[PDB]
Amino acid sequence: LQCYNCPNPTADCKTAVNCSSDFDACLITKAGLQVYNKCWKFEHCNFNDVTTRLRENELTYYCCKKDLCNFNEQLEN
């Protein structure tokens, strides 16, 4: 599966790679200004694990099981 994946949280991640076996979803997170686009685990698609793993205190996220669905345009501020 192929997701948009930036190591460091840029406001715009255009870099996409094919995610490993143990990753089943893609994630797009908008935490204030910081935007995180990451290969992700559906089970970890929840506020506590997300904030745990992003070191961000308040945010919005989107997890999807198709290729490149995790783009910034997907969340409403």
Binding site: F47, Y61, K66, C69
Partner: protein, 456 residues
């Protein structure tokens, strides 16, 4: 000469060479590795229905009795190990029958009373013999010797017509016909259906291992007649070394409930749940169907001990190889499509603001979806009434469907202060989706208080 017959007939059987742990194997159906989740919106629910593939290997020893095979069953009966045996409709072999020693395990039986021998064992001769020994026991020891019932309890979640065949034997195909099982229901996730077999076993007629293969037949029979009459290496014979007597039953439990633990409740009845059991349909066969459970309870608890009228019907029988006299164990293998149905019901949040202060409410949650091409997604939701000032009388109720989870909530009390223009009241995350929950507020700007109410 007689020993010549003996050693001859012993001579062929050990010469037959086969794999016991293979000959008795059946394959119902094999299917492809497969799983599919599909989630539906239904009134009052978001329901997630997940089908996956499962396979089963069920190795059983004790076989079942029925109308079709009851005429072919008794201690010492000779049978055909093949497709016939596998359909639980085995072919008996008509040979001259040698004396067979039987032992019924009724309590109180001392001396040689415990044992019996049938010179020319025949279904009539033996059935009447065991029936009579039982009758000996019913006027004698039954008065001061009680026997409950050894309870053999087997149950399972109904999935396929193929897998029920695997668990309870191919035989069920015939017996379980009239109780009307609707598989399409279960697969549609409307019904949750369970099947259970109960074997109340009282007394057992156990035939001793004959000294020789030749000890199972009378004289005047030879290696040739067997291969003539279908008995060979290809399809070897095996004999019933045990028969069990008592009451057995096939019970179907049709439930509207989509609960996780229904099986455990079903078991519990025998060995909260009360609700799922309030509406549950029962239909069974005896060897009547009603929408109540007291039926079942009284049916089992009635037959928990032995009737004094007469002998019981044989329900289980065990077979053993003539060759090695080792226990015969049928292995059953089959693939089927397991179906899981999980239901997530709706909920509502009611908002009351009675505090003098003009507060603002912040409500967030998580949402379980699917998108576009249909591939499932999870997303973060935020309420529209967030960041809005609310007055002395303000009421709104938020409707939540089953796809909503992990609600997060903050409420901010106003301060007339220029600094810290809003003040914290209540903040908590990971709130369950309760059918109804009431968040209310009361008090002064200096003494603000609130409500987190579990209504249901």
């Amino acid at each position: 000469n007689s020993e010549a017959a003996k050693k001859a007939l012993n001579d062929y059987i050990w010469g037959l060479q086969y794999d016991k742990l293979n000959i008795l194997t059946h394959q119902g159906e094999k299917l492809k590795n497969h799983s599919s989740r599909e989630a539906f919106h239904r009134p009052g629910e978001y329901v997630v229905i997940e089908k996956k593939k499962q396979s089963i290997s069920n190795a059983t020893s004790k076989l079942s009795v029925s109308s079709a095979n009851d005429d072919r069953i008794f201690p010492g009966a000779l049978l055909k190990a093949d497709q016939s045996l596998l359909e639980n409709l085995p072919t008996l072999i008509p040979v001259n029958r040698g004396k067979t020693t039987i032992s019924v395990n009724l309590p109180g039986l001392k001396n040689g009373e415990s044992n019996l021998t049938v010179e020319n064992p025949s279904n009539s001769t033996v059935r009447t013999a065991v029936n009579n020994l039982v009758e000996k026991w019913i006027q004698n020891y039954s008065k001061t010797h009680a026997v409950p019932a050894r309870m053999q309890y087997e149950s399972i979640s109904a999935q396929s017509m193929s897998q029920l065949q695997a668990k309870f034997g191919a035989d069920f195909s015939k017996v379980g016909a009239p109780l009307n099982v609707d598989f399409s229901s279960v697969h549609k996730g409307e019904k949750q259906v369970f099947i259970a077999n109960f074997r109340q076993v009282y007394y057992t007629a156990s035939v001793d291992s004959p000294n020789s293969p030749s000890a199972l037949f009378g004289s005047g029979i030879t290696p040739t007649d067997l291969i003539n009459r279908g008995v060979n290496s290809k399809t070897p014979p095996v004999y019933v070394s045990n028969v069990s007597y008592g009451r057995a039953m096939y019970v179907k439990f049709e439930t509207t409930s989509k609960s996780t633990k229904v099986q455990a409740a079903i078991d519990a009845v025998v060995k909260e749940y009360e609700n799922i059991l309030k509406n549950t349909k029962i239909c069974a066969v005896v060897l009547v169907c009603t929408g109540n459970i007291d039926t079942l309870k009284d049916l089992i608890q009635k037959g928990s001990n032995f009737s004094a009228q007469s002998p019981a019907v044989p329900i289980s029988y065990t077979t053993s190889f003539v060759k090695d006299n080792s226990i015969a164990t049928i292995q059953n293998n089959t693939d089927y499509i397991e179906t899981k149905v999980t239901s997530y019901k709706d909920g509502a949040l009611t908002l009351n603001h009675d505090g003098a202060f003009v507060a603002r409410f912040y409500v967030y949650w998580e949402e379980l979806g699917h998108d576009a091409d249909g591939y499932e997604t999870i997303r973060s939701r935020s309420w529209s009434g967030n960041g809005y000032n609310r007055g002395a009388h303000y009421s709104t109720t938020l409707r939540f469907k089953g796809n909503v989870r992990n609600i997060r909530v903050k409420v901010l009390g106003a301060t007339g202060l220029a600094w810290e223009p809003w003040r914290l009241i209540y903040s908590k995350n990971d709130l369950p989706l309760v059918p109804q929950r009431n968040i209310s507020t009361w008090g002064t700007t200096l003494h603000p208080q609130f409500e987190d109410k579990v209504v249901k």
